Amino acid sequence: GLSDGEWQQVLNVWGKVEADIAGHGQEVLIRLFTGHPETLEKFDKFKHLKTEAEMKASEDLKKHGTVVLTALGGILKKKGHHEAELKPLAQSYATKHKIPIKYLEFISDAIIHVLHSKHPGDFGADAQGAMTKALELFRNDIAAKYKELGFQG
Numbered sequence: 001g002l003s004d005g006e007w008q009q010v011l012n013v014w015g016k017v018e019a020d021i022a023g024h025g026q027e028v029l030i031r032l033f034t035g036h037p038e039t040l041e042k043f044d045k046f047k048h049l050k051t052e053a054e055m056k057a058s059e060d061l062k063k064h065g066t067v068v069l070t071a072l073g074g075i076l077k078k079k080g081h082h083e084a085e086l087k088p089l090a091q092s093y094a095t096k097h098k099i100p101i102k103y104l105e106f107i108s109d110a111i112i113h114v115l116h117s118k119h120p121g122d123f124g125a126d127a128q129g130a131m132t133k134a135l136e137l138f139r140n141d142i143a144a145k146y147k148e149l150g151f152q153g
């Protein structure tokens, strides 16, 4: 768990995202897809995109970036009491989509990257530690549900 102080940092940093949800959302999705092309194959919707220029020009990709980050902001505001929120995603990814926990590791890292890229010098050592921990808690609670459901890999 995180202390109240670490949660305060997480929600302060999130304010940065809330000022431009689509821009951050889009950058996150591009960093995942170019760094790990295998991830793109889980989206029938975007598998056509080949070049980063195409990704950048896709309005639909921006839309999907908004949907993802809005869902994450909701979960983070619960300060760890997010069991109702996580259930649909975990059940969905463990049975229908078959999303390895590794992909969640990948997008967590992509979020950290984007925050440093868009706010250089404004995302401190303490803020990075608190944001890293919050994304780990999210991943670990999903990992618990994956074990229950036998989503092995």
Ligand code: HEM
Pocket (backbone or CB within 6 Å): 039, 042, 043, 045, 067, 068, 069, 071, 072, 097, 099, 103, 104, 107
């Ligand atoms: C920060 C973590 C993530 C959050 C909060 C999140 C959230 C969401 C939301 C809110 C939806 C829309 C639900 C719906 O269509 O009913 C969605 C759909 C989806 N997400 Fe996740 N997601 C995340 C990570 C990922 C990752 C890493 C992948 C990688 C393969 C992924 C793959 C998908 C797919 C394939 C869909 C369905 C899209 C479609 O059928 O059009 N998600 N996600």
